[PDB]
Amino acid sequence: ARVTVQDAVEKIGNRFDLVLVAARRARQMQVGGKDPLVPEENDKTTVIALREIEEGLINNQILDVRERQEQQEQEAAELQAVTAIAEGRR
C-alpha cells in the first residue's frame, strides 16, 4: 500500500481527526511558502526521479497533537497577512 498510513490511524483513536491534521495544515504550508515548517528535513517523503528527491507531501508531521488551540477564522487571516506570496518574472 503506502508508507506510514495505517500507523497514523492506529496511534490515535480516530480517523476523521487525522484528516484535518494533515489537511488544513498541509495546504497552508504551500500558501505560506515553506519557512513556517520548522521541523527538520528528516520527516519528508521520498520521490525517486532523476536520481534525486523533490516535492514534499506530508503525513509525517503528525507527532505532537493537542486539544484546544486556535479558533478557525484566524488560520487564514494572519497567515496571508505575514506572507503575501505571488509570481514574478524577469
Binding site: 476523521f16 481527526d17 484535518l20 491534521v21 494533515a22 488544513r24 495544515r25 497552508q28 505560506g32 513556517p36 515548517l37 520548522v38 521541523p39 508531521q61 503528525i62 497533537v65 493537542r66 486539544e67 484546544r68 488551540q69 486556535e70 479558533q71 478557525q72 484566524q74 488560520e75 494572519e78 497567515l79
Partner: peptide, 17 residues
Amino acid sequence: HQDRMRRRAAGEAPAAP
C-alpha cells in the same frame, strides 16, 4: 471537531489568538 486542530504555525502562532 473544528475545535481541535494541528497548526499553530508549527510554533509561530500559539501567541497569535
